């Protein structure tokens, strides 16, 4: 049921979720909304290259999407991310 401790690097009112095959996304549990951008993190700077801020953490893989938009694959929660693991956490 209810549990608390450490936030999953996400703003207030939102909740991270995964699509059928494990696609991480940001949903508004309140209005069942679905968006790709993370609120806590800026709009302009969403797809950042952590390589300049710090190495990728355990359980992760960096890649590029067809449009050339890099992402990451976390093998901790078995999913694919859009925003960096450190971005949201600053």
């Amino acid at each position: 049921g209810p549990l608390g401790g450490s936030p999953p690097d996400l703003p207030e009112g939102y909740e991270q979720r995964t699509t059928q095959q494990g696609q991480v996304y940001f949903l508004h549990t309140q209005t069942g909304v679905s968006t790709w951008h993370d609120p806590r993190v800026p709009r302009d700077l969403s797809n950042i290259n952590c390589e300049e801020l710090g190495p990728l953490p355990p359980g992760w893989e960096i890649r590029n999407t067809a449009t050339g938009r890099v992402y990451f694959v976390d093998h901790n929660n078995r999913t694919t991310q859009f925003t960096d693991p450190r971005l949201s956490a600053n």
């Binding site: 696609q23 790709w36 890649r63 694959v73 078995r78 991310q81």
Partner: peptide
């Protein structure tokens, strides 16, 4: 074929590797 939204498909679903 459209999967989701008009053109909003950035991070590919999970499976250790970009699985369609």
């Amino acid at each position: 074929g459209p999967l989701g939204s008009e053109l909003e498909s950035p991070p590919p679903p999970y499976s250790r590797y970009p699985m369609d």
